[PDB]
Amino acid sequence: MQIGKIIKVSGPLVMAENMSEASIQDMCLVGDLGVIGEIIEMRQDVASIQVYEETSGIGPGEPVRSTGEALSVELGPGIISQMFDGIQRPLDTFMEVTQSNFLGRGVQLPALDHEKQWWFEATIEEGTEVSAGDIIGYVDETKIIQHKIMVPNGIKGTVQKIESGSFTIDDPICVIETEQGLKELTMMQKWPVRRGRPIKQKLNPDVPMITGQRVIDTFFPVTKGGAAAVPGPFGAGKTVVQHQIAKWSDVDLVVYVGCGERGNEMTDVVNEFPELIDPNTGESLMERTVLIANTSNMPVAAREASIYTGITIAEYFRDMGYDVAIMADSTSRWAEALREMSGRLEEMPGDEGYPAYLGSRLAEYYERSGRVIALGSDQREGSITAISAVSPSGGDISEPVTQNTLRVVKVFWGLDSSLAQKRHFPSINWIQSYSLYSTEVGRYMDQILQQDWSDMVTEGMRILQEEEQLNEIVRLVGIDSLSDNDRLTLEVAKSIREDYLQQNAFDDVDTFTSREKQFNMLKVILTFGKEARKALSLGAYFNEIMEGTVAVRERISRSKYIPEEELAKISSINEEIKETIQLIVS
Amino acid sequence: AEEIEKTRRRVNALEYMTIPQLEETIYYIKMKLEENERAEVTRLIKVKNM
Amino acid sequence: MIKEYRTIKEVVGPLMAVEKVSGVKYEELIEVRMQNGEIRRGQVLEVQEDKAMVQIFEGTSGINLKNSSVRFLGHPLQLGVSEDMIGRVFDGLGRPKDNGPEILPEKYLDINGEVINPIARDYPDEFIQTGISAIDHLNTLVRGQKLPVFSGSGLPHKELAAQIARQATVLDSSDDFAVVFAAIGITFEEAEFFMEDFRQTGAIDRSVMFMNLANDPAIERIATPRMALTAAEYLAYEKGMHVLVIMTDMTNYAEALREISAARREVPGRRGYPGYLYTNLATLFERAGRIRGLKGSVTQIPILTMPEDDKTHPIPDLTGYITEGQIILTRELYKSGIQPPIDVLPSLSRLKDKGTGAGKTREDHAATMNQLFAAYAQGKQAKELAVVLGESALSDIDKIYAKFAERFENEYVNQGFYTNRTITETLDLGWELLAMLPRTELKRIKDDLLDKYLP
Amino acid sequence: KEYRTIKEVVGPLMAVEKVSGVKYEELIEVRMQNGEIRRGQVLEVQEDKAMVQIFEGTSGINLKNSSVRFLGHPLQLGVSEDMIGRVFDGLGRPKDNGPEILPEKYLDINGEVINPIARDYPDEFIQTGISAIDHLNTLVRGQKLPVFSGSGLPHKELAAQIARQATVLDSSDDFAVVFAAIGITFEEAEFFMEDFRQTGAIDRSVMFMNLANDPAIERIATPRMALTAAEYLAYEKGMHVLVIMTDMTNYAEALREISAARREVPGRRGYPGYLYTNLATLFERAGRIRGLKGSVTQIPILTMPEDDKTHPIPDLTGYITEGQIILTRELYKSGIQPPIDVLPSLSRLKDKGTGAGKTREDHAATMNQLFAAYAQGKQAKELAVVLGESALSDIDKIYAKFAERFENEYVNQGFYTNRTITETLDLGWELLAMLPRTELKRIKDDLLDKYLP
Ligand SMILES: Nc1ncnc2c1ncn2[C@@H]1O[C@H](COP(=O)(O)OP(=O)(O)O)[C@@H](O)[C@H]1O
Ligand SMILES: [Mg+2]
């Protein structure tokens, strides 16, 4: 019980003496209000504290008491369908405890309902020599997902007692006989956020994810446990994309982390996600998602916390064996948060003022994801997919954040203002965007669908690649000038980017396109792509065929809008384009 | 004869407008980052001398 | 009690060092009283041990250190709020400038305010008719939204604001906006424009204004937009009013921050601006929206002049990343005699989705704008090729778009600053302009939707 | 001698007081109150105190109840004959779960500068199995040939492909391949280790692995370890060694981090003022030596930020290394594997490993012919798409048909397809055979009809 004393206050930085007993990166309570802060460095007796709340009205002389523990998150029942703060505080409960529409100060609150009854079905038998990570029972938190209680690390012994029944996360649900003494366990375990949760070993992500977005699922795919980055200027649709992925992903759990970005974007999510319903869960999406909200006008130090808390919760459900996806929006805000604290500490800055340890700190975040096998010997596989939103200033991707991200990721969806200008949504630049998981995703998918998908996506990209090289001359020579057969290439790539790539997320059917339906559109266009070549080989003038297109091209323009169940429509329109140059060649 | 004029226009428009606008722009762009680079270097020395 | 010290250590520019003090807090409002008797307000920037650094708003001219004292008011910089504020105009620090009667203030509110709890914050979906078609239809504005204007020096942004301010009314209601205007470092002529315009639209009786002109101290600009936003959230939440927030120039605000930052020898970010610019700006713009249970609303339309006419400059960059879209002005359009000169392509609204559709507008509202975008994007680019390679170098369909692109600018964008277009007229005109294209080219509008609304 | 005198902790930096006999860059380790043990290094030492940077971070340390020990030695490496086959970390510790080696001796990883008069220049040709590298930009022993890539250009496949296929010819000397990995994602690390295991190259190579999340201070030591190990295999064991390092861009990013730690002001583009020299210290340590039968050859790989050579990382590298192998985005997006573009690519000492005694007698003569014909074919191609196919003289049309056939069949072999030197040379003839006998003005009357189909 060593009570420290403040000797300096400068914005988010509080210097306090009499803290020699405390340790680095311990949490504190600062001032008479007891606002939540954290020691960042210690010079002799005096400790330096960054505060996760506004310090308006705090002065020297006021007390500071350490807590002895680092920043940690509690992992147990009641964690799903809840929007938390960067330091994990239930905003709904916060509103119910503070009785205001605003965020108060110095108001502590336990992140989970310790006064709630949860039925716990024990699924392990007594007298079992368990180790760290082993499951002892599950609690059906949602109708779709069960909360498997695991053995906290550092604990191996033999189970003494265990039974089904209604408890809270406070009262003991089990007892293990460890060598260091008798240890009893509960449904809740707490873990430091800046410490990677241990694993047996780690796997290569093989299984492709279902985004529903035709652009990325086809040409630039991300596997389950892969690292994807979405760099782009404001208005490109970085948040929209991450919302679209969160809605229709084939994963089992999602952690949407919103740090340093708009508040309405989060209230939008809690207003709608309870009302949206989509498989693989028969129930709502809130029974699958976990929100960590940090608005731009929230305390700056709390931004780094929000990232490290959202990934720890992800690692938690990863250890169960579930496939989880974490959306960081935006990762640039984390860096800009670090830039302030680096400046306020008068540290020697790196590129663009960012700390020189930015590249290393980002690597730690991404090397804490991916498909792995959990601890124990049950050997469940769990994957963490990272969908990071990078927001480079001016749109220049040569910034430190985008650069250090593209060094430790395998997937990059470069957005550009030029396409968002044309309202080409989603605005992913197909020429530069790239996925190193391309070849392996293609293998998986040509097996599953049993169609020549690998051959189709590669040539579909070539018609795009050719489209780019062929407008380079249109400026110079003109449209009718030469390479007349290449005009067909331009008017089928025109359909590629306008009928297949342009995926509006607003319409009630093209919000999501299933893989099987996603096949037909791709299929229809390159059939025609060669069916055109079939007519220009015989000698039928291209203007004639283009009229034949226009008659049937209107149909494929609509092909986005036809429902999933009736795919035959997109299968039969293919037969109609097999027909035309039989009736238009003679 | 008609196409000569079209091609002549393109050559002229490319030589007089396009290319010089490119050259003069990359120079003004080069000068900007030249100044920005050392404008930061001086500031860094101030950070160094704190 | 009263708390006053006569021990001023240093006076350097806007900053002042007071030592041998005790019990001083961060951001505490202070008052310097000089040897002559003059009172100058100030704010605590940093307090360590028995020392404290303070920023002086009114400046530090003619101060004698030894014979001057510093009073510590024991509270942060706060505004005296009231219902009587409506119809009144205050200075940069909320002091009466209109010669009106002494106000009996209701409460004293810390101008920093508090962050709206997301759970309590409910989404803005109420479409606002602004009278301007480029805004109403193509880049929609709703109430509770933070939609700024990106302009430049010489460009007519004050006219666009004044037009919106009086042509602002929401459908399905008789709710008249009670606007609040924050003048930041602007000139007399630029201020008198808003002022005079309010007097003959009668909105001066329905508004409260905060004046900080070019002859007014730059340090007051730090507080001014917070005085406005606090009065905005007071009238809108406690008194359930519908408030429209206008702030200009927003650029002059960031200039003021850099003045103090450079004075404090802080580690400078881009262009010398503070590293905490994004955060400070956010603490202004985020202070808008609607909340559960409360009928009132606070909608925000800031105005900033882009330096160098450069979108990538820190001030317009950071603002664009915070706010829910932006409205952009261009000299190219302004020189073309387009009123208002709104370049619709780089502009954006982030709440146009849930904002418009069936029930609030016609159902074609979503398909028309997306079609006009793709058409103008192709048409304008074709026009570029036309003026350099000749009109006879385009295809027949290119000239159709090029002709469309020009007609788009001259009538749809250009409507005059004193003409009010209802949302219906705009939509009707929308089809008329895109009518001159083949149906086969428009692959972005429902075919059943086409036939019904196609002319 | 454990000191319990910790005065300051700022960032990763830590201050120890009341000490003596402490040296610069001396290795330290700190015993915490909980018992956790972390390593460190003296970044600065004054008369009665010293500054140290902890590798494993500074989280959760109580200054009063923690202690520091000075080990009295810099970063050293355990040298042993039984080293080949095993995988190590950036510091030299085993990662392969094998029998911990007993080193012959410990050596400073910095090494020493080799006497200019002692240097013996390289002549022996080295086969890498890749046509674009083994014929047009031929690798010679003791050379320093880098590889310029970008984020996502398959520079990791090529890196694996080289060491697998890299082999000395005839020479009765065994072949060592000291591979070094710098700040790479696990997948990339797992990729390389697995790929070396299955190909049996693991038993023919030494591996130094360094993940991205690994501390920055050892990211900088990773190459110095490998080079010291490579120098231990060549100069004191008489073996021909080939060194591969990836990534080199990651090395600089980590080099920048410890500079800001020393509060040193960056020189250019955010990179420190000794970048060129620091690169030369670990680059220029390669080549033969007079009297000794050793050989050290480096193939450093780096990703140019946004495909730019003028960037400090590949630009400064050019002033040190002889030549460059550049991968092109346009090629990789066209399905070319490896996506090597031979025009900007270069090898300054290529002719030293060509000709009879090292390769076929037409090596140099052919090389320039394929090269000049490629450029001409590319220029025929660019004029074709602007003026139509017919505007071309039909032998400029065959130069165009040559130039794409050249990329698709010669350049593109596959990341797992080995090509011996002889198979590559007559392959050029098979492609040159497309062209008539009239244009080939770089080849003489002995060789043109001795090899042409
Ligand atoms: N895929 C998309 N489909 C349709 N509209 C989009 C799409 N992406 C973005 N938009 C439009 O652009 C706006 C910007 O969205 P947001 O994701 O917030 O941009 P960013 O994240 O880049 O700041 C949205 O309000 C939306 O109207
Ligand atoms: Mg966003």
Give the domain ranges of chain A: 1-71, 72-115+186-435, 116-185, 436-586
Is A371 in contact with D186 (CB distance < 8 Å)? no
Q: Determine the Cα–Cα distance for residues C314 and C310; give it in Å rounded to an integer.
A: 9
Q: Which helix (H) or strand (E) element contains residue A578?
A: helix A568-583
Alpha helices by DSSP H, listed for A475-508, are 485-495
Name the residue at shortest CA distance from atom 11 of ligand 1.
A237
Phi, psi of B6 (to 5 degrees): -60, -45
- Tokens found for residue C157: 């942004």
Residue written as token pair 């808008």:
C288
Ligand nearest to C-alpha A245: 1
- Cα dihedral sign, A191-A194-A199-A203: positive
How long a stretch of residues is chain D? 453
User: CB within 6 Å of ligand 1 — which residues?
Assistant: A 232, 234-240, 425-426, 504-506; C 350, 352-353
DSSP labels for A414-443?
A: -B-HHHHHTT-SS-B-TTT-EETTHHHHHH
Is A136 in contact with A159 (CB distance < 8 Å)? yes
Distances (CA, A) of C180 to C94, C113, C204: 13, 17, 10
Q: Which residues contact D215 (CB under 8 A, 6 or more apart)?
A: A360, D55, D56, D57
The verdict on whether residue A539 carries a ligand-binding annotation is: no
Is the bond leading into C249 cis (omega within 30 degrees of zero)?
Answer: yes
Query: CB count, 10 Å around CB of C265?
Result: 12
Max Cα distance, chain C (Å)? 84
The verdict on whether residue A414 carries a ligand-binding annotation is: no
Binary contact (D265, B37; C-beta < 8 A)? no
How long a stretch of residues is chain C? 455
Binary contact (A423, C374; C-beta < 8 A)? yes
Q: Which of C118, C279, C353 sits opposite A506 (nearest CB)?
A: C353
Is D250 in contact with D319 (CB distance < 8 Å)? no
Is A208 in contact with A445 (CB distance < 8 Å)? yes
Q: Are strands D27-31 and A72-75 parallel, antiparallel or unpaired?
A: unpaired
Phi, psi of A253 (to 5 degrees): -160, 145
CA distance D149 to chain B (A): 25
- Tokens found for residue A516: 């099987």
Distances (CA, A) of D8 to A556, D33, D73: 69, 16, 23
Distances (CA, A) of C151 to B1, C211, C250, C302, D142: 48, 21, 11, 11, 61
Q: How far out from the chain centre does Cα A541 lie? A: 50
Minimal-distance CA residue of chain A relative to D8: A43
E strands, A156-218, in order: 157-162, 165-167, 174-178, 181-185, 189-192, 201-202
Compute the C-alpha angle A129/A135/A141, nearest 5°: 155
E strands, A35-146, in order: 35-43, 46-51, 63-66, 72-75, 83-84, 118-122, 129-130, 135-139
Q: How far out from the chain centre does Cα A64 lie? A: 37
Task: List gaps in chain B by the residue before each (C–N > 2.5 Å).
Answer: none
The CATH number of domain A436-586 is 1.10.3720.10 = no
D–C touching, 3+ CB–CB pairs within 8 Å: no
Query: CB count, 10 Å around CB of D430?
Result: 15
E strands, A273-399, in order: 289-294, 323-329, 372-373, 381-389
Q: Determine the Cα–Cα distance for residues C41 and C220; give it in Å rounded to an integer.
A: 10
- Tokens found for residue C316: 């317009």
- Tokens found for residue C344: 């619709």
Resolution value in angstroms: 3.3
Could you tell me the distance, in angstroms and rounded to a whole number, from the CA of residue A237 to the centre of ligand 2?
7
- Nearest Cα to Cα of residue C58 among C216, C214, C186, C213: C216
In three-state secondary structure terms, D341 is: coil
Q: Which helix (H) or strand (E) element contains residue D340?
A: none
Amino acid at C81: V
Q: Determine the Cα–Cα distance for residues A414 and A430; give it in Å rounded to an integer.
A: 8
**CATH code for the part of the protein at A72-115+186-435:** 3.40.50.300
Residue written as token pair 């409205």:
C327
Binary contact (B48, D263; C-beta < 8 A)? yes
In three-state secondary structure terms, D283 is: helix
Closest ligand 1 atom, residue A389 Cα: 21
Name the residue at shortest CA distance from atom 19 of ligand 1.
A237
Q: Which residues contact A567 (CB under 8 A, 6 or more apart)?
A: A516, A517, A520
The verdict on whether residue A239 carries a ligand-binding annotation is: yes
Q: Determine the Cα–Cα distance for residues C312 and C317; give it in Å rounded to an integer.
A: 5
Q: Determine the Cα–Cα distance for residues C116 and C289; give it in Å rounded to an integer.
A: 9
Task: List gaps in chain D by the residue before each (C–N > 2.5 Å).
Answer: none
Closest ligand 1 atom, residue A240 Cα: 17
Could you tell me the distance, in angstroms and rounded to a whole number, from the CA of residue D129 to the centre of ligand 1?
49
Q: Determine the Cα–Cα distance for residues A194 and D65; give it in Å rounded to an integer.
A: 23
Task: Calculate the dihedral angle through the C-alpha atoms of A96, A102, A106, A110, rounding to the nearest 10 degrees.
Answer: 40
Query: CB count, 10 Å around CB of D412?
Result: 19
Q: Are strands C242-248 and C290-291 parallel, antiparallel or unpaired?
A: unpaired
Q: Determine the Cα–Cα distance for residues A319 and C172; give it in Å rounded to an integer.
A: 53
Interface size A-C, in CB pairs within 8 Å, comes to 194
Residue written as token pair 């008798």:
A182
Residue written as token pair 């329905």:
C206
In three-state secondary structure terms, A292 is: strand
- Nearest Cα to Cα of residue D275 among D245, D307, D316: D316
Looking at residue D167, the DSSP 8-state letter turns out to be B
In three-state secondary structure terms, D264 is: coil
- Tokens found for residue D192: 């390389």
Is A366 in contact with A222 (CB distance < 8 Å)? no
Q: Determine the Cα–Cα distance for residues A502 and A214; give it in Å rounded to an integer.
A: 8
Pocket test for ligand 1, best of A230, A240, A429 (most atoms within 8 A of CB): A240
Q: Determine the Cα–Cα distance for residues D367 and D374; give it in Å rounded to an integer.
A: 11
- Tokens found for residue C303: 């105005």
- Cα dihedral sign, A444-A447-A453-A455: positive
B48: β partners? none
The 3-class secondary structure across chain C, one letter per residue, is CCCEECCEEEEECCEEEEECCCCCCCCEEEEEECCCCCEEEEEEEEEECCEEEEEECCCCCCCCCCCCEEEEEEEECEEEECCCCCCCEECCCCCECCCCCCCCCCEEEECCCCCECCCCEECCCCEEECCCHHHHHHCCCECCCECCEEECCCCCHHHHHHHHHHCCEECCCCCECCCEEEECCECHHHHHHHHHHHHCCCCCCCCEEECCECCCCHHHHHCHHHHHHHHHHHHHHHCCCEEEEEEECCHHHHHHHHHHHHHCCCCECHHHCECCHHHHHHHHHCCCEEECCCCCEEEEEEEEECHHHCCCCHHHHHHHHHCCEEEEECHHHHHCCCCCCECCCCCEECCHHHHCCECCECCCHHHHHHHHHHHHHHHHHHHHHHHHHCHHHCCHHHHHHHHHHHHHHHHHHCCCCCCCCCHHHHHHHHHHHHCCCCHHHCCCCCHHHHHHHCC
Is A330 in contact with A391 (CB distance < 8 Å)? yes
Binary contact (A43, D8; C-beta < 8 A)? yes
Minimal-distance CA residue of chain C relative to B15: C388
Q: Determine the Cα–Cα distance for residues D40 and D12; give it in Å rounded to an integer.
A: 10
Q: Determine the Cα–Cα distance for residues A46 and A36; give it in Å rounded to an integer.
A: 18
How long a stretch of residues is chain B? 50
With contacts defined as CB-CB under 8 Å, which chain A residues touch D186? Answer: 202, 367, 370
Q: Determine the Cα–Cα distance for residues D271 and D313; give it in Å rounded to an integer.
A: 9
Looking at residue D51, the DSSP 8-state letter turns out to be E
Amino acid at C305: T
- Judged by a CB distance cut-off of 8 A, whether residue C267 touches chain B is yes
Binary contact (A271, C279; C-beta < 8 A)? no
- Tokens found for residue B30: 């080069």
**CATH code for the part of the protein at C1-455:** 3.40.50.12240
Helices A485-495, A453-474: crossing angle, 10 deg rounding: 120
Residue written as token pair 């803290």:
A19
The verdict on whether residue A137 carries a ligand-binding annotation is: no
Q: Determine the Cα–Cα distance for residues C363 and A505; give it in Å rounded to an integer.
A: 17
**CATH code for the part of the protein at D1-453:** 3.40.50.12240
CATH ID of A116-185, from 2.40.50.100, 2.170.120.12, 2.60.40.10, 2.60.120.260 = 2.40.50.100
In three-state secondary structure terms, D53 is: strand
Minimal-distance CA residue of chain B relative to A475: B10
> How is chain C split into domains, by residue range?
1-455
Could you tell me the distance, in angstroms and rounded to a whole number, from the CA of residue A83 to the centre of ligand 1?
23
| Chain B interface disruption, residue of A342, A345, A348, A351, most B CBs within 10 A | A348
C210: β partners? C90, C182
- Tokens found for residue A439: 């070849």
Q: Which residues contact D282 (CB under 8 A, 6 or more apart)?
A: D223, D224, D227
Amino acid at D138: T
CA distance D263 to chain B (A): 7
- Judged by a CB distance cut-off of 8 A, whether residue D265 touches chain B is yes
Exposed / middle / buried, residue C107 (Cβ in 10 Å: 0-12, 13-18, 19+)? exposed
